[PDB]
Design a protein around this nucleic acid. Sequence first.
RNA 1: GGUUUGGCACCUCGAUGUCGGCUCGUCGCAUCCUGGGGCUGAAGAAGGUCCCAAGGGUUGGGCUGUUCGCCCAUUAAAGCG
RNA 2: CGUAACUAUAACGGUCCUAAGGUAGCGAAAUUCCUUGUCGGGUAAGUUCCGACCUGCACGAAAAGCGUAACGACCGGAGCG
RNA 3: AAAAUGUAAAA
RNA 4: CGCGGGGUGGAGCAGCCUGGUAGCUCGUCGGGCUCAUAACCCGAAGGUCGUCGGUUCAAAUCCGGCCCCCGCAACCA
Lengths: 140, 84, 84, 37, 122
Amino acid sequence: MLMPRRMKYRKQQRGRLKGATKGGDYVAFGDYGLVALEPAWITAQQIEAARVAMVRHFRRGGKIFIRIFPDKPYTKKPLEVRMGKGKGNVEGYVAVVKPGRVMFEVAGVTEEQAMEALRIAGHKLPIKTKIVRRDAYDEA
Amino acid sequence: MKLIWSEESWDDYLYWQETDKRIVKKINELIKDTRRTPFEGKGKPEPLKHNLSGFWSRRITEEHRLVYAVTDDSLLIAACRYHY
Amino acid sequence: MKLIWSEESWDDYLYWQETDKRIVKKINELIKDTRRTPFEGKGKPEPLKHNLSGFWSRRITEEHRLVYAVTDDSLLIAACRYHY
Amino acid sequence: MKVRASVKRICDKCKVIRRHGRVYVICENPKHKQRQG
Amino acid sequence: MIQPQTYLEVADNTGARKIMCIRVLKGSNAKYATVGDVIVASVKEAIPRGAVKEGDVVKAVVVRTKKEIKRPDGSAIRFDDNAAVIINNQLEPRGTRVFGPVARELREKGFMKIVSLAPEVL
RNA sequence: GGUUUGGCACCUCGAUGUCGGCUCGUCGCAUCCUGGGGCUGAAGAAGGUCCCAAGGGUUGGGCUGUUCGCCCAUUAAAGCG
RNA sequence: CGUAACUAUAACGGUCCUAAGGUAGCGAAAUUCCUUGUCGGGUAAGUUCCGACCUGCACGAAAAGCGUAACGACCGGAGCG
RNA sequence: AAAAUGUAAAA
RNA sequence: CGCGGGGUGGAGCAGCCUGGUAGCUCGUCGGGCUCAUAACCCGAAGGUCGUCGGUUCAAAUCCGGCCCCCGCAACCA
Ligand SMILES: [Mg+2]
Ligand SMILES: [Mg+2]
Ligand SMILES: [Mg+2]
Ligand SMILES: [Mg+2]
Ligand SMILES: [Mg+2]
Ligand SMILES: [Mg+2]
Ligand SMILES: [Mg+2]
Ligand SMILES: [Mg+2]
Ligand SMILES: [Mg+2]
Ligand SMILES: [Mg+2]
Ligand SMILES: [Mg+2]
Ligand SMILES: [Mg+2]
Ligand SMILES: [Mg+2]
Ligand SMILES: [Mg+2]
Ligand SMILES: [Mg+2]
Ligand SMILES: [Mg+2]
Ligand SMILES: [Mg+2]
């Protein structure tokens, strides 16, 4: 799936997503990247769905770079129960994404392909996306 | 009902096939008379007990005999020469 | 080591007692080389793909080739000729 | 595909005529006819 | 005026003696059934050996009714009982004979065999 | 969307009678028939899928308190709220 | 937990525990949750009813057990008139 | 004291 | 799911409370008694202690998260 192999704590608070992006705002790996326009919690399985989606498209092709990692535990209470009596049990994991974060990067494939492969992945996603090239990403 | 021999059976059978054809053909003759419908058939079926119990015996040529086991498809030949 | 024989994997060796035992010789010789060498030596014993995933085919002549399938002590017989 | 919310082009002979306020998609072959409803 | 639950005297030798009207086969909600209308039914009591056994769901044509039939010519005909005549899916009589008079409404309704067979027609 | 099971505990505990049926309806459309129509792997008859459209229709029994179901015999259909 | 001629099932056995492990007879019952159990029967159609089978959630011997002619403004299922 | 059973081919 | 009990050789049970190696009966194995099989007698080997982590110098044992087994509770409208 994709989830921390171990954790200091098993349940962690929610906290709000405030603009910016803090990191991964520039490419740094492949030739084409996919960035987030709006903030959200991406589920460990929205990723895997986008990832697969990518390869599914260009079979035996380039290399895919998953720039984000769902390390935050998503809680949920049992169906039909009242408020209280503790915090829910963990239902799955997510990764906090903010406008500017590059989520996926492909390399080793014709532009025309990377455009599609990434485009498809954007669909398996809860937020709006924008594809990129590799120009001024020269912080290195 | 797949056929299954074993150590003492294949060796028991090879000797029959390479020492006398009168009983080789007689042996597999019953194997076909069983393979389909076990128990009832030729030779002279008869449920065995003790040493064999779960094994069945088909009278062949008096002295000689053939022991087997039936199990929802898959027979099991155990012996070809000697009384019991 | 018990010997296995499918439905079709039986009538073959069985009709070989009516049409030249030549091919029989192979069966038997090949059988023993398999009791101490699952798939080594005689008939350049090799494995199989797709259809026969996990089946090792031993060379009888060049056409026919009895495919075995050893497992927890038990040599299997599937097809001495054609296929399944 | 007569009706949907994602009328796109399918074949290279598919036109995106826009009539009666609706975004139809006429094409050489019927199976491609559409209408964004 | 036959309706479901009504008992019909069977006017033929199909072996049956009395049938219960299961349903009237006219419209999709026909209220009653009269001379000439077809009906589905249950055999309530039949004779020993017979083409029909009780418990069988059959089909039949109403041939006699206790409620007078009005004739287009202002006359009326009324019988002492409510009888029918079992027929098959092709609407042909399952029996070889028919007993007691029958209403000529039976002809225009298109049941010739029954009419010819009928000993009298009023 | 607000028909289900719930969450919340806002009017109502100086009382808002709380299932099912019967009678009387009326409204919605996400249409069960019937009316128009586009594709179809539509030859034809018959179907499938989507679109338009409630004007009017939308049966009688067996079982169970049942709603619901299942079954019998029908039907143009035996629509859902 | 294991075991008999396919399968099934287990008269038999092994072991742990008890004060002792429910006998006869009844058994989806005024008791059976799953359940409208599954076969019959009755009906055109039967969640009820009657007869059976028993994996008896959760009968069982004097808070009696299983029956029983007669009796009943008792509760159930059927016909006929 | 007490101690069970029986290997299936009749010339 | 809410409570509490329990997964230890092939089977069925001890050991866990009192952390420092594992016991009991049956079975399995080798050998006798026998004409032979039981029974009987002699002597054997066999246990990752459900699992993934923890505390400890050391975990079957103590703390934890899941995983199946068993048993109770699921009431008033
Ligand atoms: Mg057996
Ligand atoms: Mg009868
Ligand atoms: Mg509500
Ligand atoms: Mg309040
Ligand atoms: Mg408050
Ligand atoms: Mg109140
Ligand atoms: Mg008031
Ligand atoms: Mg209710
Ligand atoms: Mg509409
Ligand atoms: Mg016992
Ligand atoms: Mg019952
Ligand atoms: Mg109940
Ligand atoms: Mg009735
Ligand atoms: Mg009733
Ligand atoms: Mg009694
Ligand atoms: Mg004897
Ligand atoms: Mg011994």
